[PDB]
Design a binder for this molecule. Structure first.
Ligand SMILES: O=C(O)[C@@H]1O[C@@H](O[C@@H]2[C@H](O)[C@@H](NS(=O)(=O)O)[C@@H](O[C@@H]3[C@H](O)[C@@H](OS(=O)(=O)O)[C@H](O[C@@H]4[C@H](O)[C@@H](NS(=O)(=O)O)[C@@H](O[C@H]5[C@H](O)[C@@H](OS(=O)(=O)O)[C@H](O[C@H]6[C@H](O)[C@@H](NS(=O)(=O)O)[C@@H](O[C@H]7[C@H](O)[C@@H](OS(=O)(=O)O)[C@H](O)O[C@H]7C(=O)O)O[C@@H]6COS(=O)(=O)O)O[C@H]5C(=O)O)O[C@@H]4COS(=O)(=O)O)O[C@H]3C(=O)O)O[C@@H]2COS(=O)(=O)O)[C@H](OS(=O)(=O)O)[C@@H](O)[C@H]1O[C@H]1O[C@H](COS(=O)(=O)O)[C@H](O[C@@H]2O[C@@H](C(=O)O)[C@@H](O[C@H]3O[C@H](COS(=O)(=O)O)[C@@H](O)[C@H](O)[C@H]3NS(=O)(=O)O)[C@H](O)[C@H]2OS(=O)(=O)O)[C@H](O)[C@H]1NS(=O)(=O)O
Ligand SMILES: [Cu+2]
Ligand SMILES: [Zn+2]
Lengths: 179, 211, 921, 210
């Protein structure tokens, strides 16, 4: 017997990655700390978006490592911001007639794309490449989301005449009482 | 030499191929050799042909391609193509992750929220849980009367929102509406309304407070 | 074979075991060679006694002061050296036979009878003792005549002369001695004697001269070894090697080029002398194709002559080459490192698993220190631990150990300004009697124990904490977020429901706001759920003075913040988590105070104390019915704080406590006291009394400064007042009778917070890191585990500080308000937290059971990782809280109530009557 | 001079294709002549270029085919293979209609059914609503009290459905199973099977009877 698969429905609470392809290459949408948005071939911790809805059909895409927001400009160039831009950085979501998502700005009409042929969203005429996204659940463990690891250097007395290499004598900060 | 070699390397870049269910997938490993190497297609590293797949698969040798029509969720995993001959054997592993896309109105649990009664001074809570893949937005509305009746000039009811879906609140803390120390004025019709790109679905409940 | 050690960094790249790194024990293997060494010129002196010849160290220290004419006067004091050996309890003396004394006039001449008589006296004195001697034939003291006539070691005929000298030694002491070393540290005899000129010959010709003289050194060593093998071994049965020496090195970055450069450096320094004698007979290829026209080449006969002429692998890892005399060119811009264990692993891999023998080891001390040294003791302890780890954890055939310089003496370029002796001796005296240093006592105990066996004071204890124990967590940077989730939109909307549910706002109507019942606060429930998961029983957070009363006075109370805190307390109580709050904490941009107070000294004005009294009264009357364990001032900084500030802090704490006691005790029945910080201060040398009283002074300057007025007698600690009066620093305020009566008893439970342990020694050896104000030298042991923040994991410190508190301030109920360590990584650093928490809880249980203290609480630090970074049990990644393994182990300890062992089937506490909690007093 | 013709006219007799949704389709219209006729297509009106469909179209000039991947119900219509040559042109038609499919299991309305109590020989009603685009394939599968465990040899056939697929199996009236005069003869749990060409939705909860 074909044992039942896990329950359908509630799978959007948590991190998602926006996969897309054009039968020549496959990319997951990824937001970089420097405000760069690009397609990573694999699932990177910088590609972990968290889509949250405000109205009925108007999503905002955050990403949990860059801390950016997926925001847009007047010529359609996707980028990442740090402060909310509700008039420009909040995309109307839509689901095409083959299960593929599309995200278009409500005022710019330019579909969210990973390519360089952004266009207006006509009612099912033709989409630009890399604009028909698909949400895939996150499989990256959260331990790799703590990748920022405090690691500084000591380099104490870099001259080649050091008299205490293992740092046994460790002075402790104080306050000398000079009136 | 007779060692196998890929005919087109630019056609072998779709490492992770994901598709909505009931669709068709098309792998190919175009190679050549002297003599032409044979192909072994392994599902998760295990030999596979059109035997455990309902509907059958095609493994035509003329194009070095494997097609799968009407894919199903029970097809996820690695798919390794091997081209082998007496002068070399090489492999390439694609990955298939078939998704399940259901573009319908937000379907929320039946019987929730339900009619409730409470003694004045107690506390109640209403529950509504939605099931839709398009990131639905959930709010709660209490039916109130503004000046006269609870009905507007066009028959449209008067409601006040109680808890909407902001970007700063998770969806675990929105599926419950907690009325603490319910008074007499907070006894009407509470509707959980959910909306995605397809449409809106709402369920109503009634809370009655007794002295 | 060459290259087998190139992966030593790779083998040590991965993090080691976080429990066997500092809590590593185990006796050394039986048949171990515990040794303590010495040199010839460093210790003998008597540069012209009994008609000895002139070395090259008597024509270098004499106008090339600080000479070695009489360094330790051990030429005639032969009895005291062996007396010190017997008292030390050692089984191998590593001394040197000086070339110039046994053959003063010439090898082709009459040997000096007096020098041989002295050496045979030494051998017969240390043979009846029970010590097998180890001798080195050449310890840099080449005779001056051989330096002048043939040009020193540069000549190739001189090698034969060496053999002649060696021959007579093999004829005389062959019956007694069974270990010989032909050359000591040939690197600093071929390089710093003939290339840079810093040592005795000091001609500093060129690198080419150094390489040629090293070639001649290798030839002479081969000649002597073959003389021994062919003519003397079948009659005396001994071993001969060459005392090689090396450092450790680490790559700048974990690439392959850097690793190969490190291997090249190690080949340049040590393989340069080790490969021809141990592997094949020629110089390492990493250096042959780098100085082709600089270094000479062996013929095939020479290649067969050098290979296999060393029985064991003598190693000299000390301060004579590491970090002092290594030429930076041989380092190849990598990072030098004194890691003995990795070097031993590299030797074992590279040179075909030989019998390593550390024939010289141990760091140095500044030249002014008397018999109380503690940097040397801990460096020696670390090196011995590294040797033990290499023997056990990696299987390296180490057959002995030799701490260097039994007694002080010359240092060959550092004069008398450096002390390396296990036994102190004052060169300004005339008797020069050996006084045992602290390191001498440590070595005595280490030999007697024969390693580091499991101590009885570190065995885990099985048993349960008493019932009603306060198991809790701590989050004092609580994330206040008073936004209201529901019922916050007052507008009336019109909700068309046919072609719609795009509800539209209708203007002109705004309804009233529902009463702000505190379920609305969204940022409360997740924290309560996280606390509920780990089964804690006491959450501890801190109130914010700058938010409740932003202006400073009672005219601008922010009631919303108080409502949020009252909900936090109510929700905590509702789920059986009794809350503990702290009124003030010094961790804030301005001392945890309102800006108005912070802009007026913020602790010098007594009005600050009065304002804190008013604020404490307000917080007692707002949150007082839910919170019932109050903490007045949470871990004040006892170092980065003045004395008037501490006086006013004490006055404010007394004001707050009396406000509670006289107003809100018969109505709320809570408890209130202060929470100090009590890290343990251990004397560095456990047998000397100066650092003991110095540790006492540091303790009473840290703990007893803010605790004796409250918990103790009432006045400031007497040791502190004496110390401040002796230095004529009359900056300690005096307690008036009114203040002494006010403050003497403002406490209901002692509350400490232990994190680590610091050792203190009372010897000034480098005033740069000295603490002149307290006259303390603060060190840390390096065999302890260290968190990425370089903080020491010391379990027994908690028990020691609890016993000290009970002994000093009577018998009081004690809470451990905060006790936790930090992490920098994510994979294995949390395992360090698991180990530290388990051992610290075990030590607290030990202190409770078999010491009698009334410890009835414990609060693990850092509830989550968002408020306290690098510290939290609940890591905060991608705006999601995931538990660490430390949380699960802590919960396992909690719900089992300690460490019950096999008898985990009892409760035995119906209607608990332990009088430390809220009882009838 | 002469008009061009086809090479394989046996495959041109099928104007109608009953293709399923979410499946690629290919239209083969081969022809031959002197000279080679142009390979052009049209869609009952304007020129059927690649920007009037979701996913685009591909034209193959080897066997003169037009392929469209992941067909969509909007692709229904009357395509025309028109091959133009200087010596006349050749017309042929394709009437394409797409059988509807659905990229999901029958969406079971969660929470149905409940745990009612059939105490004192009462009656029970059970609910199962599936929000599928098409008409699903639904069985009830009241459990069988054999061996106690509903899963024996990895899915033992405990199916005892009394209302199988048919004209009465739709999304309008078969939502409710009514068991009347229920004595102590059905304990444990029930199930609810729905399915189509993709998968099986199967979920239920405990039951109470006396
Ligand atoms: O073999 C064959 O045939 C084939 O082959 C192949 O194919 C191919 C190829 O591949 C391709 N190429 S690629 O590239 O892709 O790779 C193509 O090609 C060609 C050429 O070559 C080319 O060139 S080159 O140079 O490359 O060379 C070209 O191309 C390309 C493309 O194409 C184009 N386009 S088109 O349209 O033309 O197409 C272009 O493109 C471009 C564009 O642009 C676009 O694209 S598109 O497409 O869309 O157009 C894109 O773009 C974009 C971009 O991206 C963007 N950018 S960004 O940045 O944003 O991102 C934009 O752009 C832009 C720019 O960029 C900018 O700038 S910047 O700088 O900033 O960047 C600016 O802004 O600007 C802008 C603009 O726009 O401007 O945008 C765009 C978009 O746009 S739109 O328009 O869209 O709007 O992309 C681009 C690119 O670049 O890419 O170009 C390209 C180039 O590339 S490169 O790299 O160079 O660059 O051209 C072409 C042409 O031709 O045209 O195609 C080809 C085809 O071939 S043929 O021969 O056909 O002719 C393949 O393979 S492979 O491996 O090789 O690959 C495949 O396909 C194959 O095959 C198939 O087929 C066959 C047959 O079929 S049929 O149907 O006809 O028949 C076969 O089959 C099947 O099967 C079989 C068997 O089974 O066997 C058969 O059958 C038979 O048999 C059977 C048996 O039986 S049993 O029983 O046994 O079973 C029987 O049954 C039967 O009956 C029989 N029949 S028969 O009759 O045959 O006899 C069957 O039938 C069949 O069937 S089916 O159906 O299935 O088919 C085989 O098998 C198959 N295979 S499969 O598997 O697939 O199926
Ligand atoms: Cu559907
Ligand atoms: Zn000391």
């Amino acid at each position: 017997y074909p044992n039942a698969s896990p329950l359908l429905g509630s799978s959007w609470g948590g991190l998602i990655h926006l996969y897309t392809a054009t039968a020549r290459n496959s990319y997951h949408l990824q937001i970089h700390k420097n405000g760069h948005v690009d397609g990573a071939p694999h699932q990177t911790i910088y590609s972990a978006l968290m889509i949250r809805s405000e109205d009925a059909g108007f999503v905002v895409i955050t990403g949990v490592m860059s801390r950016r927001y997926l925001c847009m400009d007047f010529r359609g160039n996707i980028f990442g911001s740090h402060y909310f831009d509700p008039e420009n950085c909040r995309f109307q979501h839509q689901t095409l007639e083959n299960g593929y998502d599309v995200y278009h700005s409500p005022q710019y009409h330019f579909l969210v794309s990973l390519g360089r042929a952004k266009r207006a969203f006509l009612p099912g005429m033709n989409p630009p490449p890399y604009s028909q996204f698909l949400s895939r659940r996150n499989e990256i463990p959260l331990i790799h989301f703590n990748t920022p690891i405090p690691r500084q250097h000591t380099q104490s007395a870099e001259d080649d005449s050091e008299r205490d290499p293992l740092n046994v004598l460790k002075p402790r900060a104080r306050m000398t009482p000079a009136p | 030499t007779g060692a196998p070699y890929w005919t087109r390397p630019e056609r072998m870049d779709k490492k992770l191929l994901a598709v909505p269910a009931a669709n068709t997938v098309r792998f190919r490993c175009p190679a050549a050799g002297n003599p032409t190497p044979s192909i072994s297609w392994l599902k998760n590293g295990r030999e596979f042909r059109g035997e455990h797949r309902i509907g059958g698969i095609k493994l035509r040798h003329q194009q070095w391609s494997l097609v799968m029509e009407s894919v199903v969720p029970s097809d996820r995993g690695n798919y390794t193509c091997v081209v082998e001959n007496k002068f070399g054997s090489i492999r390439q592993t694609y990955t298939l992750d078939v998704l399940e896309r259901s573009p319908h109105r937000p379907i929320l649990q039946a019987g929730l929220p339900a009619n409730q009664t409470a003694v004045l001074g107690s506390d109640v809570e209403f529950h509504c849980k939605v099931y839709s893949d398009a990131q639905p937005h959930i709010q709660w509305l209490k039916h109130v009367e503004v000046n006269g009746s609870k009905v507007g000039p066009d028959g449209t009811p008067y409601v006040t929102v109680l808890k909407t879906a902001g970007a700063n609140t998770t969806d675990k803390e929105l599926e419950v509406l907690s009325l603490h120390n319910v008074t007499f004025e907070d006894a009407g019709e509470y509707t959980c309304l959910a909306g995605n790109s397809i449409g809106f679905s709402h369920h109503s409940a009634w809370l009655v407070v007794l002295p | 074979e060459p290259g087998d050690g190139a992966q030593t960094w790779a083998r040590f790249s991965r993090p080691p075991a976080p429990e066997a790194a500092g809590l590593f024990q185990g006796t050394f293997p039986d048949g171990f060679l515990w040794a303590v060494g010495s040199a010839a010129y460093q210790t003998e002196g008597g540069w012209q006694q009994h008609g000895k010849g002139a070395s090259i160290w008597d024509t270098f220290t004499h106008h090339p002061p600080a000479t070695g004419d009489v360094a330790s006067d051990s030429y005639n004091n032969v009895f005291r050296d062996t007396e010190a050996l017997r008292e030390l309890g050692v089984t191998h003396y590593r001394f040197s036979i000086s070339w110039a004394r046994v053959l003063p006039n010439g090898s082709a001449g009459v040997p000096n009878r007096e020098g041989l008589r002295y050496y045979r006296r030494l051998l017969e004195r240390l043979r009846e003792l029970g010590v097998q001697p180890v001798v080195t034939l050449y310890h840099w003291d080449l005779p001056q005549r051989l330096q002048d006539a043939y040009g020193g070691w540069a000549n190739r005929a001189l090698a034969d002369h060496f053999r002649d000298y060696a021959e007579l030694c093999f004829r005389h002491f062959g019956g007694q001695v069974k270990y010989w070393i032909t050359i000591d540290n040939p690197y600093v005899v071929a390089w710093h004697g003939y290339a840079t000129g810093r040592l005795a010959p000091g001609i500093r010709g060129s690198p080419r001269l150094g390489y040629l003289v090293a070639h001649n050194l290798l030839l002479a060593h081969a000649k002597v070894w073959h003389l021994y093998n062919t003519s003397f071994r079948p009659t005396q049965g001994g071993q001969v090697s060459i005392a090689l020496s090396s450092h450790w090195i680490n790559p700048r970055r974990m690439t392959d080029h850097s690793i190969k450069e490190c291997q090249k450096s190690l080949d340049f320094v040590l393989g340069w002398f080790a490969k021809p004698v141990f592997i094949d007979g020629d110089y390492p290829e990493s250096m042959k194709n780098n100085l082709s026209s600089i270094l000479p080449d062996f013929t095939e006969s020479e290649k067969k002559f050098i290979k296999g002429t060393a029985d064991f692998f003598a190693l000299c890892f000390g301060p004579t080459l590491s970090f002092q005399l290594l030429d930076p060119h041989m380092k190849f811009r990598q990072l030098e490192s004194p890691n003995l264990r990795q070097l031993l692993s590299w030797i074992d891999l590279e040179f075909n698993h030989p019998q390593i023998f550390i024939v010289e080891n141990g760091w140095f001390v500044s030249g002014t220190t008397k018999r109380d040294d503690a940097k040397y003791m801990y460096y020696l302890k670390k090196f011995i631990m590294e040797t033990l780890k290499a023997i056990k954890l990696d299987g390296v055939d180490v057959i002995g150990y030799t701490a260097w310089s039994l007694m002080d003496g010359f240092e060959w370029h550092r004069g008398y300004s450096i002390r390396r002796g296990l036994f102190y001796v004052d060169f300004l005296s005339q008797d020069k009697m050996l006084l045992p240093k602290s390191s001498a006592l440590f070595y005595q105990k280490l030999i007697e124990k024969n390693g580091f066996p499991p101590l009885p004071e570190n065995q885990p204890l099985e048993g349960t904490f008493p019932c009603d124990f306060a198991w809790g967590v701590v989050d004092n940077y609580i994330q206040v977020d008073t936004t209201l989730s529901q019922f916050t939109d007052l507008n009336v909307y019109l909700w068309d429901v046919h072609h719609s549910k795009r509800l539209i706002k209708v203007d002109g109507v705004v309804t009233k706001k529902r009463k702000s019942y505190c379920v609305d606060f969204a940022a409360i429930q997740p924290q309560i759920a996280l606390l509920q998961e780990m089964h804690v029983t006491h959450f501890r957070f801190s109130l914010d003075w700058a938010l409740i009363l932003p202006l400073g006075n009672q005219s601008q109370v922010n009631h919303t913040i108080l409502q949020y805190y009252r909900c936090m307390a109510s929700e905590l109580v509702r789920v059986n988590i009794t809350p503990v709050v702290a009124l003030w904490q010094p961790m804030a941009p301005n001392q945890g105070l309102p800006r108005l107070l912070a802009r007026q000294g913020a602790w010098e004005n007594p009005y600050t104390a009065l304002a804190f009294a008013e604020y404490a009264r307000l917080c007692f009357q707002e949150l007082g019915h839910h919170v019932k364990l109050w903490i007045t001032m949470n871990e004040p900084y006892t170092r980065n704080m003045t004395y008037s500030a501490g006086h006013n802090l004490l006055k404010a704490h007394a004001l707050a406590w009396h406000v509670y006691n006289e107003k809100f005790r018969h109505a709320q029945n809570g408890k209130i006291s202060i929470a100090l910080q009590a890290d343990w201060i251990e004397p560095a040398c456990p047998f000397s009394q100066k650092d003991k009283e110095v540790a006492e002074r540091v303790l009473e300057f840290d703990i007893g400064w803010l605790a004796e007025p409250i918990f103790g007698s009432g006045d400031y600690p007497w040791v502190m007042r004496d110390w401040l009066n002796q230095r004529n620093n009359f900056l300690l305020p005096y307690f008036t009778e009114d203040e002494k009566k006010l403050i003497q008893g403002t406490f209901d439970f002692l509350a400490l917070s232990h994190y680590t342990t610091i050792l203190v020694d009372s010897e000034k050896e480098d005033p740069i890191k000295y603490n002149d104000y307290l006259e303390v030298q603060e060190m840390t042991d390096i065999t302890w585990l260290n968190s990425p923040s370089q903080v020491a994991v010391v379990p027994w410190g908690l028990r020691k500080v609890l016993n000290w508190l009970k002994f000093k301030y009577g018998d009081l109920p004690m809470y451990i308000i905060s006790n936790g360590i930090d992490d920098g990584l994510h994979a294995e650093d949390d395992q360090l937290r698991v180990y530290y928490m388990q051992n610290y809880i075990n030590e607290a249980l030990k202190a409770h059971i078999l010491d009698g203290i009334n410890l009835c609480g414990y609060f693990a630090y850092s509830f989550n990782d968002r408020t306290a970074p690098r510290f939290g049990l609940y890591r905060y990644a991608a705006d999601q809280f995931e538990p660490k393994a430390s949380m699960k182990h802590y919960r396992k300890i909690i719900d089992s109530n300690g460490f019950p062992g096999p008898e985990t089937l009892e409760r035995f506490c119906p209607e608990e009557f332990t009088v430390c909690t809220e009882c009838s007093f």
